[PDB]
Design a protein around this ligand. Structure first.
Ligand SMILES: CCC(O)(CC)COc1ccc([Si@](C)(c2ccccc2)c2ccc(OC[C@@H](O)CCC(=O)O)c(C)c2)cc1C
Lengths: 240, 11
């Protein structure tokens, strides 16, 4: 039942991800270096990592079918509200349940709960973040489902400040129906059992994670010495 | 409340 339009969408999104996610992690050497041993010693490195990721998320979003039919203002509202969530989603590709860490090809660039703690965050965020990463990894998503879920996340019509919420909803529905039909036609049981509902629950989980990250980010970035270590793009997108 | 960097990355 996967229409030709739906096959087209999946192909575009797969290509978009391949063009915006580099699983060699070669660019990490351009970031300010990790420091692991009170001070927020990992804030410079993780700010650069996050800023880099935001650029990749914007590059992916621009390729979503229909996204560029939105106004510039609506494109900005969707990216500002979703970037944090898509970073959590896309980072699941490097996350491993072996030791609950994000392994980006190198001991320098393998991160655990202690690293994000050394950027100022607390267990109020980290504990649900890890639960989310585990629950998402356990879904064993096809790459097709992974890229559809990122795109559905970005094109959400209930983000605050959306103007043309009905066009946003129209675009998201085309993606949602593509995903629902993909699961039925290409994801064998038992892996497909309740799969779409479980993926939509992950989008709900991300809203709560967004809220707690935003709360902690506001507290951290209110201190000028912390803001000094951020990047201009992080300040624009996450807030100043 | 302007987003020149985001706006620039959106082409
Ligand atoms: C004020 C501090 C702050 O709020 C803002 C600056 C801090 O914000 C943070 C800090 C950390 C994280 Si993390 C879930 C994490 C969790 C636990 C430990 C370390 C990091 C993460 C992000 C990207 C990433 O990887 C990018 C690769 O996915 C890019 C691949 C590509 O696109 O080519 C990996 C692997 C992990 C997210 C955010 C928003």
């Amino acid at each position: 039942k996967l229409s030709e339009e739906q096959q087209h969408i999946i192909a575009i999104l797969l290509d978009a991800h391949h063009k915006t996610y580099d699983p060699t992690y070669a660019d990490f050497r351009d970031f300010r270096p990790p420091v692991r041993m009170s001070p927020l010693s990992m804030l410079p490195h993780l700010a650069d990592l996050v800023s880099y990721s935001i650029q990749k998320v914007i590059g992916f979003a621009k390729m979503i079918p229909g996204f560029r039919d939105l106004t510039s203002d609506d494109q900005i509202v969707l990216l500002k509200s979703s970037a944090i969530e898509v970073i959590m989603l896309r980072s699941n590709q490097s996350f491993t349940m072996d030791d609950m860490s994000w392994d980006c090809g190198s001991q320098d660039y393998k991160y655990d709960v202690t690293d994000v703690s050394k950027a100022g965050h607390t267990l109020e965020l980290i504990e649900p973040l890890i639960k989310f990463q585990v629950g998402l990894k356990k879904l064993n998503l096809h790459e097709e489902e992974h890229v559809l879920l990122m795109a559905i996340c970005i094109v959400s019509p209930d983000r605050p400040g959306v103007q043309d919420a009905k066009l946003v909803e129209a675009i998201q529905d085309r993606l949602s129906n593509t995903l629902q039909t993909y699961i039925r036609c290409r994801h064998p049981p038992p892996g497909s059992h309740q799969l779409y509902a479980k993926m939509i629950q992950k989008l709900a989980d991300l809203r709560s994670l967004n809220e707690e990250h935003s709360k902690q980010y506001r507290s951290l970035s209110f201190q000028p010495e912390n803001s000094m270590k951020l990047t201009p793009l992080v300040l624009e997108v996450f807030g100043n | 409340k302007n987003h020149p960097m985001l706006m620039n990355l959106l082409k």
